[PDB]
Structure 1
Amino acid sequence: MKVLVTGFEPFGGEKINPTERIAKDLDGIKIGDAQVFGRVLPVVFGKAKEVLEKTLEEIKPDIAIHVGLAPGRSAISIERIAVNAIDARIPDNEGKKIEDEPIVPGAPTAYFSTLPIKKIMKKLHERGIPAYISNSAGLYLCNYVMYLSLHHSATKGYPKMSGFIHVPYIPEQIIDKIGKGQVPPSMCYEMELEAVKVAIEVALEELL
């Protein structure tokens, strides 16, 4: 079984993106008898599409789990829906901000995630990791690769399971926000990584 786990580079503002570390730390491990690959996507619409599609073609994973930073979220959120729209608030890392374009013209308005989101959520709860299901992943790069991946699954037949997991800030990112008079929630890195490993394990146990 191959599993692709992606993460992103530092989105605008942040100096660190914990999903870049989760991708690198899971690269090359084996969970059960499944090889796990970990790749870090650019936060550039276009280039991220190019890279995501080469990686999908090249590895042909059975399960792809895309992970991103959700600033200000307080628990792990498992994404339910990806939607066919880009309405970027911030610019991407090249400086382009896209207001209301579709991702794939004429492709469906939305795709539901194919990961077993409620079993992933229940198992995370059993391990004491607070987690919930979110119904919107945003309309910037996190939703763009979540849509592109489930579109690829519908079109080409693989990956067989695709989905997105958003993670809080890790504590070390909070301490310079304190300075600007704000203290957003955080989760420690080790719980974040453990969470996307539990996700890979219950996706594998479902996927035959």
Structure 2
Amino acid sequence: MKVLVTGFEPFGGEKINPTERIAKDLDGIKIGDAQVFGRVLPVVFGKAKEVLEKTLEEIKPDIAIHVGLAPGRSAISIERIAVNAIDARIPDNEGKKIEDEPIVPGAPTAYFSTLPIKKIMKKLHERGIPAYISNSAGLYLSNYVMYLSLHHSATKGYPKMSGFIHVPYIPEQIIDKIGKGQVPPSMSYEMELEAVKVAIEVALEELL
């Protein structure tokens, strides 16, 4: 079994992205039988697609789990739908703000996630990790790589399970927002890392 876990580099003035450090910490580990591969994608439209399609070609994983920073979210949000659109409020890391573009012209409006999302969520809960089902992943880079990967799954037969997990801020990133009058929700790094490993595990008890 081969399992891809991606995370992103820091974007829009974040000094840090907790998902980069999750991609890197799950890289090369094995959950029993299954090899896990962890890769960090650019927050750059175009380049992220390119890098993601090479990686899926090269590893050809059975389960792909894409992870992102969802600022101001208070729990682990498990994504239900990727939609065929970019409408970037902020620019990707190269300066490209893209308003109202399809991701794949002619490809479906939307794709549902193939991860067992309610089981993942229920498991997280009995681990005492607060989690819920999100119904929008935005229309920036999370939804973009969440859509391109459910599309390659549909087009090429692999990955077999694909989806997206949004994690809160970690505590160490809150303490300079406090500074400009703001205190967002956070979640410890350790809870987040564990949440994406509990996810990998209910994905494997399902995907055969």
Aligned mates of 1:117, 1:80 — CA distance in 2: 8
Task: State the distance in 1 between where 2:56 and 2:3 align.
Answer: 10
Question: 2:185 and 2:72 mapped to 1: Cα distance?
Answer: 6
Per-residue CA deviations over 1:65-124 (Å, capped at 9, x if unaligned) read 000000000000000000000000000000000000000000000000000000000000
* SS at 1:176 equivalent: coil
CA RMSD of aligned residues (A): 0.3
Counterpart of 2:177 in 1: which secondary structure?
helix
Structure 1 equivalent of residue 199 of structure 2: 199
Aligned to 2:164: 164
SS of 2:49's equivalent? helix
- Mapped to 2, the partners of 1:14 and 1:161 lie a distance apart of 30
> How far apart in 1 are the matches of 2:123 and 2:143?
24
What is the TM-score with the length of structure 2 in the denominator?
1.00
- Deviation per residue, 1:157-198 (Å, 9 max, x gap): 000000000000000000000001000000000000000000
Q: Quote how far apart the aligned CAs of 1:11 are.
A: 1.0
Structure 1 counterpart SS, 2:176? helix
Are 2:62 and 1:74 aligned? Answer: no
SS at match of 2:54: helix
Give the distance between the partners of 1:204 and 1:32, measured in 2 at CA.
10
Q: CA deviation at 1:12?
A: 1.2
SS of alignment partner, residue 85 of structure 2: coil
Distance across 2 between alignment mates of 1:165 and 1:11: 17
- 1:39-63 residue CA offsets vs partner (Å, 9 max, x unmatched): 0000000000000000000000000
Q: Name the CA distance, whole Å, in 2 between partners of 1:185 and 1:149.
A: 29
Secondary structure of the residue aligned to 1:202 is: helix
% of aligned pairs identical? Answer: 99
**Structure 2, unaligned stretches of length 5 or more?**
none
CA displacement at 1:32 relative to structure 2: 1.4
1-structure distance, mates of 2:202, 2:91? 35
Corresponding residue of 1:42: 42
Matched, 1:174 2:174: yes
1:31 paired with 2:31, answer yes
Give the number of equivalent residue pairs: 208
Q: Which runs of 5+ in 1 are unaligned?
A: none
SS of residue paired to 2:175: helix
Shift of 1:30: 0.2
